[PDB]
Amino acid sequence: ENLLELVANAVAEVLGHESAAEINVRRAFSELGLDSLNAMALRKRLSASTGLRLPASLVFDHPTVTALAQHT
Amino acid sequence: TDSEKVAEYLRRATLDLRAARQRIRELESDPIAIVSMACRLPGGVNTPQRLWELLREGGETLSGFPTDRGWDLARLHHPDPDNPGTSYVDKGGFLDDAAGFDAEFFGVSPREAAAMDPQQRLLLETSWELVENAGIDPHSLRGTATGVFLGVAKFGYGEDGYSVTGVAPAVASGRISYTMGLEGPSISVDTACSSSLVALHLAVESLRKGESSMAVVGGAAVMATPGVFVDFSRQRALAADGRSKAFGAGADGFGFSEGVTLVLLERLSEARRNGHEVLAVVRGSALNQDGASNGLSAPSGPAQRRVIRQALESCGLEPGDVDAVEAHGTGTALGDPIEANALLDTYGRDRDADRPLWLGSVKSNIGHTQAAAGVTGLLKVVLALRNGELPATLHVEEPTPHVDWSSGGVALLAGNQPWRRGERTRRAAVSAFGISGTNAHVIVEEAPEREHRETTAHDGRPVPLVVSARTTAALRAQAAQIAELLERPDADLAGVGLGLATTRARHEHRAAVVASTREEAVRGLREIAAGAATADAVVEGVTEVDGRNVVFLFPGQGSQWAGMGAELLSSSPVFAGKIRACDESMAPMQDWKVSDVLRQAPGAPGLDRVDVVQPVLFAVMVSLAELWRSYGVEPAAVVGHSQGEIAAAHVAGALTLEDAAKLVVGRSRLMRSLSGEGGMAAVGEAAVRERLRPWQDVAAVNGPRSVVVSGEPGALRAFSEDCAAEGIRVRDIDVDYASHSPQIERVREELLETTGDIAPRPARVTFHSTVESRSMDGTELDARYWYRNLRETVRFADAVTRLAESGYDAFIEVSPHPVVVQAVEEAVEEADGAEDAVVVGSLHRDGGDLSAFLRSMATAHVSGVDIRWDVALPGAAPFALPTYPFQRKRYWLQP
Amino acid sequence: SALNQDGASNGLSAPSGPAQRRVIRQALESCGLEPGDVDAVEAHGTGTA
């Protein structure tokens, strides 16, 4: 639950947002705006922060931000 | 017959010939109706506001070189026309704000939004507004065959990251079809100042070929960089005091600033069939080239005459059937005399005798507007048809003396002329001449008159007023405009949630209000963006699934209200019809009428004897379902228990009406022989199970703490008092009976012989039961099953929990009862399911009426489940609709 | 000939197959020839995807 803020600020950084808090937790990635290799940039940011692996299927595993509890 | 088959062949040949000629005529020419319009001119939105209002007097040319953009000042302006890198004339209108955008509404990242030409943003906004202002819900256009045929030019770029910057200023921006989800052809043309016009021509052809249903035609410009204002200043073409004068005593040719315009076109027959609104008709166009002239950029009169005559021939009309012409003004020292001479030569030559051909130009009042000029002319002409007046601005008195202005029937529009309807159907023409040398001409005609309508309403008739699409816009804030956009000086009804275009699917947020007196929207709903409400449903839906699965509950035995309402019986017709049908079905076996008891008419029996209480409730419950199903709510897994098992079976289609009624009455009568011999208890399962050991006497499990246990006669009252000495939420029990208990006995098998007459049928949807924690099936129901229903324990909470994590899921427990009795009270969060639980109620226990049912539906319209509100409003007409707020600055990378 | 738009599908790029299916069908049906007369097809293919 502590990494939710990490995920939110990583998403804001990769998407160009500055508030890092005005992001709908329960919303699809497409509605919030996303493209191709933005996912791999987010994966690199998570690997730098969390240190976990890069399954590359996490985006389609759970598009909603509120379902980002798969870490660890 | 030899003398008959030949006649039949002749008739078929004649019919086929007529059809073929009609098809040929349709293909070679077909009226095209203009359905809607939207524009963004510098200084104000569109339609009336920035039009019939401003066009009455004029003005414009506010000058004021924009400061929001970079645009280094104090250097562009210099008095010397021959200065190397400066430019004179610092006047010229401009858009109030070009950096405004919403971004999040259309789902684009702010990083990509910053690197984005303003033309695309303005085009997206204007296209949404255009679709909205047509009575067509934008979300229904998805998957259709509409195409875009626009014309856009590249005006500067950002001279200062894995993507974009090669796709945003890409000219070919057909991303409108990407966002909306269209399938028609997407084309971006470029033919200088006439581009929009020729674009229009292409669309017409597609609309006559059947490859597209509706078309979007328009143009745009932004003038991002100083650019043109410098370069033309070095050509000595642009002149000071940039008020362009058409057919006067001046020569400027001023290159006015940006402007965005769009229109929607559809075939006339389709528009009439579907039921849209028609404003004007296009019935001919022509294009040509100046050919080899005396210069690359120089008009040629013969080409203009040829194109005008070609357009007239294509329309199949006569040159004397046009009353007003909009000219390609572009006030210069050479173009105006040539255009005037060409018009005099082609439209003159004894036009009528007394009727003169009125002439005007929009550019004399609004500016050149670059590529979107020609379509802008349309925005004038059509309005002249809708107001019976010619907006003759033409801010110049003395005409040009070079051209023989007199001795002709072409009169300049000095003042204003009435344009009233009546005989001699009105017609008009527009023309455009580009720099490259392409000329276009178009003829437009007034729409046919069909306006009768009717008047209704003004009765009580409570009307739902579902919000004007509380949407993905910031989850807040925008509610403000919807609160204030609904300000009614003098009107009524105005069905917004109707098929009316404003629908917008209420993207995520949604809200509702139900009343019939006044607005009350400026009340709590208004401050809901920063506060709370009093009696209005507010929802935070996420449209997890737009169409939710549906299930119903049917347990009663304890509602026992004081009369299940009567106003809805008089008002709602389907409820009364079902009640009457049930009464007729039950009439030939028992004397009592359910309607009489419901109305509380004199002579009706009291609500004490079970023989009346049990059937009447049944007669209500099914009817309630018939109401819900009447609103597009189709259940799937009715799971109601107790005496409502049979009601659920009837809703499931496994039983007939008369069979269920006779079973109900027989069961009640046979049970009536037992009285004052039983009673349950209302409460931990293990605690009561281990505590009831000293007694030889379980009924139902409604939850972790709502278990109903089987009891015994008055010794059970003593046990209940003993428990009430402790806590354990000791409660009371209803009328005496010992159902779901072994203490029934008595007739026993006598029921099976008396109650066995049924012909069970396969279930239509699902008949999941509580006696067995699994789905039942049709034709598997027998008198023994209902005997065990009254004898065995009820497993309700476990079944509900099992269904909660089931595949259908959807947490849409409705419970159509005259009482709340929703003892489930969620109790599904500990079922490894989702979190968007609805568990809505039904008709209120005490304050129940049609308005209460509408309120319950609105409170049901929360989350995802959808209903058709048009049923509640039989006979109406859409009124009007505003648009979406809240742009923000993006500044398009100034450094 | 025939023309159509891919519509809303994934990102702006990376076209969708059904759109190509529909455009092929429309092109074949415009002239009125069954899809058994074409002997060679010119393809528009470049690298990935």
The chain A residue lying nearest B834, using CA atoms, is A67
Q: How far is A60 from chain B (nearest CA, A)?
A: 16
**Single-letter residue type at B444:** V
Two tokens at B117? 């030409």
The answer to whether B183 contacts C7, with C-beta atoms less than 8 Å apart, is yes
β-bridge partners, C10: none
B702, B823 Cβ separation under 8 angstroms:
yes
The answer to whether B177 contacts C19, with C-beta atoms less than 8 Å apart, is no
Long-range contact pairs involving B398-401 (C-beta distance under 8 Å, separation at least 24):
B398/B248, B398/B249, B399/B247, B399/B248, B400/B247, B400/B248, B400/B249, B400/B336, B400/B337, B400/B340
Gap between the Cα atoms of B628 and B843, Å rounded? 11
Two tokens at B57? 């007097």
Instruction: Say if B111 is an interface residue toward chain A (CB within 8 Å).
Output: yes
Gap between the Cα atoms of B741 and B696, Å rounded? 12
For residue C3, which residues of chain B lie inside 8 Å, CB to CB? 185, 211
Gap between the Cα atoms of B665 and B587, Å rounded? 11
Two tokens at B36? 């809607």
Gap between the Cα atoms of A54 and A48, Å rounded? 11
Q: How far is A45 from chain B (nearest CA, A)?
A: 16
Long-range contact pairs involving B344-348 (C-beta distance under 8 Å, separation at least 24):
B344/B403, B344/B404, B344/B408, B344/B410, B345/B301, B345/B305, B346/B304, B346/B305, B346/B308, B346/B309, B346/B319, B347/B308, B347/B319, B347/B322, B347/B410, B348/B408, B348/B409, B348/B410
Provide the pairing of β-strand B100-101 with B427-433. Answer: unpaired
The answer to whether B185 contacts C5, with C-beta atoms less than 8 Å apart, is yes
Q: φ, ψ for residue B623 (rounded to 5)?
A: -60, -40
Gap between the Cα atoms of B213 and A45, Å rounded? 47
- The number of residues making up chain B comes to 895
Gap between the Cα atoms of B542 and B414, Å rounded? 58
Does an H or E element contain C31, and which? helix C17-31
Q: φ, ψ for residue B396 (rounded to 5)?
A: -160, 135
Using CA atoms, how far residue B844 sits from B123, B506, B523, B561, in Å, is 49, 27, 24, 10
- Give me the sheet containing B427-433, strands edge to edge: B186-189, B147-152, B214-220, B260-267, B32-40, B280-289, B438-446, B427-433, B324-326, B358-360
Of B316, B214, B200, B321, give the one whose Cα is nearest residue B269: B214
Angle between helices B644-651 and B783-791 (to 10 degrees): 140
B484, B522 Cβ separation under 8 angstroms:
yes
For residue A32, which residues of chain B lie inside 8 Å, CB to CB? 104, 107
For residue B104, which residues of chain A lie inside 8 Å, CB to CB? 32-33
Residue B838, CA atoms < 13 Å, CB-side half-sphere:
32
The answer to whether A33 contacts B542, with C-beta atoms less than 8 Å apart, is no
The answer to whether B111 contacts A35, with C-beta atoms less than 8 Å apart, is no
Instruction: Say if C5 is an interface residue toward chain B (CB within 8 Å).
Output: yes
Q: What is the dihedral of CA B617, B621, B626, B627, to 10 degrees?
A: 100
Q: Spell out the residues 6+ positions from residue B193 whose beta carbon is closer than 8 angstroms to its own.
A: B328, B330, B368, B370, B371, B373, B374, B432, B433, B434, B435
β-bridge partners, B733: none
β-bridge partners, B779: none
How many pairs of residues across A and B have Cβ atoms under 8 Å apart?
A: 30
Which experimental method was this entry solved with?
A: cryo-EM
> DSSP code of B53?
I
Q: What angle do CA A20, B833, B792 make, to 5 degrees?
A: 160
Residue located via tokens 């005490």: B846
Instruction: Say if B211 is an interface residue toward chain C (CB within 8 Å).
Output: yes
Instruction: Say if B616 is an interface residue toward chain C (CB within 8 Å).
Output: no
Residue B129, CA atoms < 13 Å, CB-side half-sphere:
21
How many pairs of residues across B and C have Cβ atoms under 8 Å apart?
A: 30
The answer to whether B180 contacts C8, with C-beta atoms less than 8 Å apart, is yes
Query: What's the reported resolution, in angstroms, to a tenth?
Result: 3.4
Of B659, B662, B729, B744, give the one whose Cα is nearest residue B699: B744
Of B189, B176, B120, give the one whose Cα is nearest residue B150: B189
Q: State the CB neighbour count (10 A cutoff) for residue B156.
A: 15
Gap between the Cα atoms of B389 and B380, Å rounded? 11
Angle between helices B610-629 and B644-651 (to 10 degrees): 30
B495, B873 Cβ separation under 8 angstroms:
yes
Q: Spell out the residues 6+ positions from residue B13 whose beta carbon is closer than 8 angstroms to its own.
A: none
Instruction: Say if B107 is an interface residue toward chain A (CB within 8 Å).
Output: yes
B149 by DSSP, 3-state: which? strand
Q: What is the dihedral of CA B779, B782, B787, B792, to 10 degrees?
A: -40
The chain B residue lying nearest C10, using CA atoms, is B178
B511, B536 Cβ separation under 8 angstroms:
yes
* B 83-142: CB under 8 A from C: 142
